[PDB]
Amino acid sequence: APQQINDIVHRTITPLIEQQKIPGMAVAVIYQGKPYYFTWGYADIAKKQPVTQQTLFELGSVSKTFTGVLGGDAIARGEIKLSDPTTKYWPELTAKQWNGITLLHLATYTAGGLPLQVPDEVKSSSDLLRFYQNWQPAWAPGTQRLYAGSSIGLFGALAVKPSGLSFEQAMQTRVFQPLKLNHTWINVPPAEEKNYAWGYREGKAVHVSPGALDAEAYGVKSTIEDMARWVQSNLKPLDINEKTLQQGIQLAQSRYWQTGDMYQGLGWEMLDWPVNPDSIINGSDNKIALAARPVKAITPPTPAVRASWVHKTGATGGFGSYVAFIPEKELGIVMLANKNYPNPARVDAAWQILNALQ
Numbered sequence: 581a582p583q584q585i586n587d588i589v590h591r592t593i594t595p596l597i598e599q600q601k602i603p604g605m606a607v608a609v610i611y612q613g614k615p616y617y618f619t620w621g622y623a624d625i626a627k628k629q630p631v632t633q634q635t636l637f638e639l640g641s642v643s644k645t646f647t648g649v650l651g652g653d654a655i656a657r658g659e660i661k662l663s664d665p666t667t668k669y670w671p672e673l674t675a676k677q678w679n680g681i682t683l684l685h686l687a688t689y690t691a692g693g694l695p696l697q698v699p700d701e702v703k704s705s706s707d708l709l710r711f712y713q714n715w716q717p718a719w720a721p722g723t724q725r726l727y728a729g730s731s732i733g734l735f736g737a738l739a740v741k742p743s744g745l746s747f748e749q750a751m752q753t754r755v756f757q758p759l760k761l762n763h764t765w766i767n768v769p770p771a772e773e774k775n776y777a778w779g780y781r782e783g784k785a786v787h788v789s790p791g792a793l794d795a796e797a798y799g800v801k802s803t804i805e806d807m808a809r810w811v812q813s814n815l816k817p818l819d820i821n822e823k824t825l826q827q828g829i830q831l832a833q834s835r836y837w838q839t840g841d842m843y844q845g846l847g848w849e850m851l852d853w854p855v856n857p858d859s860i861i862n863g864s865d866n867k868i869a870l871a872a873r874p875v876k877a878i879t880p881p882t883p884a885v886r887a888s889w890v891h892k893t894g895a896t897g898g899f900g901s902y903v904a905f906i907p908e909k910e911l912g913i914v915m916l917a918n919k920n921y922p923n924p925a926r927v928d929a930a931w932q933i934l935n936a937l938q
């Protein structure tokens with residue numbers, strides 16, 4: 581019953597905010613098809629603007645879930661295949677290392693060591709091309725997983741090319757609108773500026789900066805309500821009336837690669853439920869999560885497994901986000917904060933809450 585929810589959430593999150601000195605935070609728990617919302621603190625400290633259910637947070641790397649699903653939808657539409665070579669979409673990518681790198685590799689960080697970020701010196705499309713052309717792999721395609729915004733980013737930009745739409749147009753018309761995420765943005769419009777929290781880094785108020793392939797890797801700003809709706813859409817894709825979008829959501833939770841007890845989806849990462857909590861909490865530390873690891877191909881990919889812990893962490897310089905959910909149990913959580921605090925604290929809090937509700 582809802583008292584269970586309130587009790588575990590309050591007991592769990594109030595110490596976390598105190599320990600991590602989080603200025604503002606929004607949490608949603610999704611339980612049996614219903615969301616339950618909790619907010620604390622300030623969206624803007626200087627102006628004493630409180631966090632509310634309409635406050636926008638930067639998702640950072642959680643945006644990659646949207647990118648994964650938008651790709652999944654382009655696959656379902658027959659516009660692209662994950663088996664296609666990158667060069668089919670960017671024929672200017674002629675350097676020899678691109679021979680053998682597929683869209684699957686890009687989408688799943690397995691191209692052979694594309695880096696965590698696109699370098700800050702890349703400001704133009706010619707700078708981008710030069711970057712990928714000069715890039716030297718460390719491993720053969722499909723052999724090591726190295727978590728990389730420059731990999732999934734490129735996938736995003738390539739995956740929308742056949743549509744004829746920009747990445748933002750594709751995401752708005754094919755994902756945001758059908759799911760009725762009407763307070764979810766890649767570019768925040770004037771009507772929402774008042775709701776857009778500041779991030780806090782070493783005490784300074786900050787917003788994410790423009791960057792190459794930002795829309796694709798870390799584009800999205802959203803509210804706790806819309807994120808709870810994103811979680812629900814991903815927990816229960818069969819309720820989605822748009823067929824290609826339903827299928828895309830399912831494709832993003834297919835298991836493509838395994839490393840240790842983790843399975844790579846498109847954006848999403850997955851473990852079998854029940855999980856070992858120490859494995860996901862410690863696994864979330866950047867020392868571990870950003871390290872290169874050999875992967876085993878799952879040939880062919882396993883379709884979305886209901887008994888999974890499905891999750892993704894995200895950060896910008898000012899923001900820390902986490903989404904997890906367990907489809908078999910109709911259970912999930914969203915944690916949005918306007919400080920970047922360590923991932924294991926997010927994941928530990930989330931597990932404490934969801935495990936209690938299972």
Ligand SMILES: *C(=O)[C@](NC(=O)Cc1cccs1)(OC)[C@@H]1N=C(C(=O)O)C(=C)CS1
Nearest residue numbers: 640641696697729797798866894895896897
């Ligand atoms: C995902 O969260 C991450 N970064 C972002 O999404 C957005 C940015 C963070 C800093 C500038 S943009 O991968 C793309 C995280 N980035 C970092 C990083 O600082 O490079 C991490 C240490 C974890 S993954």
